[PDB]
Write a protein that binds this ligand. Structure first.
Ligand SMILES: Brc1ccc(-n2ccnc2)cc1
Length: 410
């Protein structure tokens, strides 16, 4: 019996920021007066682009007030232009409490769509830049012993450029910024750049800007209290190709970008994905800890190394990572295994949910029960309701259920 996945319209994107669809404006080896202040970096990133144009709505939010999102992007550009004219460029920027920002800050079965599997595939790929330092992984108070060091270095080599790692660091930055603004600017509609930092294959430090968020009032007395925000994210993805994915968004067209491509220079429109969203103290605390995804992935790898190593009465770390009884690597290479474990862990973070919790526990139970049956038989009901009670509309849970059905047919 495969699981019954629900029927209904396709599921929609529900992450706090864009994943495979993000777009970066970047400055290499930055060295401007006041480098390392997000607002300064963001302005310098904005001014690397010359394709801006009069924005318009190209995919409206069917339940929101689309004029207000348009006005909010134009307000960002206007107020950033103001900062540019003040002699001393300030450190933070508190937006005027306009009607459009007041409205936007707040002052059902879905079927599995193909996009979430593509997101996951994109998360496993390598990028052309590194997102962590060599000793990023680990909190150890003492120097780690020799084998632990060797394993960390092999693993880091495999995942440092991974796209899932860019999501970790992106996620860590924006949650840190938003949590700190939530407490330092409680009453302000603070403009918060979405920034990440990486290093090129040639070693050039780069600062990247994905877009902006604007927080609402945030007198967060509890971990579960919510700060609303509006997010505004560049993308080269035309939302008209997969409209169902962008149900929660109003999408503007804001410029045109000249691109290197397999056909040479091409001009492509630049979009801006706009939605209203919210988070809480406790979720922002969790987002600041996303580097733990790296430790948890590493630890799953080390389990496998220790199992093979107990079988051989010998450490198998070199033999494992260099792919020297096992006669192959199902994913194709040791690197893809590491990055797949990572991508799984990061997507558990990015798409956390009660649905994911129930499915994770109740499917482990059904797994072990089906395992003991396949092993102890030839080919020839209640727990099933527990799992499928989590199969409602969440893309990550549905994708994992899809995967579970594949582990059944095999
Ligand atoms: Br910084 C910056 C860069 C561009 C714009 N802008 C305004 C209109 N189009 C682009 C505003 C601020």
């Amino acid at each position: 019996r495969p699981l019954r996945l629900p029927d209904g319209p396709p599921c929609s994107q529900r992450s706090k920021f864009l994943l495979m669809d993000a777009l970066k404006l970047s400055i290499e080896d930055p060295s401007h007066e006041g480098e390392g202040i997000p607002l300064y970096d963001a302005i310098k990133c904005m001014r690397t682009f010359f394709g801006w144009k009069e924005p318009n709505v190209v995919k409206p939010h069917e339940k929101g007030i689309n004029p207000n999102y348009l006005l909010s992007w134009k307000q960002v550009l206007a107020e950033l232009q103001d900062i540019e004219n003040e002699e001393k460029i300030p450190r933070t920027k508190n937006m005027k409490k306009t009607s459009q920002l007041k409205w936007a800050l707040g002052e059902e079965l879905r079927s599995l769509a193909s996009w979430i599997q593509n997101e996951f595939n994109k998360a496993c790929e390598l990028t052309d830049s590194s997102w962590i330092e060599l000793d990023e992984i680990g909190e150890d108070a003492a120097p780690i012993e020799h084998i632990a060091s060797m394993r960390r270095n092999y693993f880091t080599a495999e995942v440092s450029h991974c796209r899932a790692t860019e999501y970790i660091m992106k996620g860590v930055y924006i949650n840190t910024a938003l949590l700190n603004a939530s407490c330092a600017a409680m009453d302000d509609f603070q403009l918060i750049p979405m920034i990440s930092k990486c290093r090129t294959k040639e070693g050039r430090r780069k600062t990247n800007l994905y877009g902006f968020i604007i927080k609402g009032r945030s007198h967060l007395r509890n971990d579960t209290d919510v700060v609303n925000f509006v997010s505004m994210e560049f993308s080269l993805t035309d939302p008209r190709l997969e409209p169902h994915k962008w149900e929660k968004y109003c999408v503007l067209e804001v410029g045109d970008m000249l691109l290197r491509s397999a056909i040479g220079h091409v001009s492509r429109p630049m979009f801006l994905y706009v939605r209203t969203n919210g988070t809480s103290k406790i979720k922002m605390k969790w987002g600041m800890e996303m580097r733990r995804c790296l430790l948890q992935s590493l630890q799953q790898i080390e389990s496998m190394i220790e199992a093979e190593s107990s079988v051989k009465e010998k450490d198998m770390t070199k033999e494992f990572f260099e792919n020297k009884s096992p006669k192959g690597v199902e994913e194709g290479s040791i690197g893809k295994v590491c990055r797949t474990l990572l991508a799984k862990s990061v997507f558990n973070s990015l798409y956390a949910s009660p649905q994911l919790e129930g499915f994770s526990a109740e499917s482990r139970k059904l797994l072990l029960i089906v395992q003991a049956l396949r092993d102890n038989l030839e080919p020839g009901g209640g727990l099933y309701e527990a799992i499928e009670e989590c199969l409602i509309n969440d893309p990550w849970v549905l994708l994992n259920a899809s995967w579970f059905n594949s582990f059944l047919t095999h």
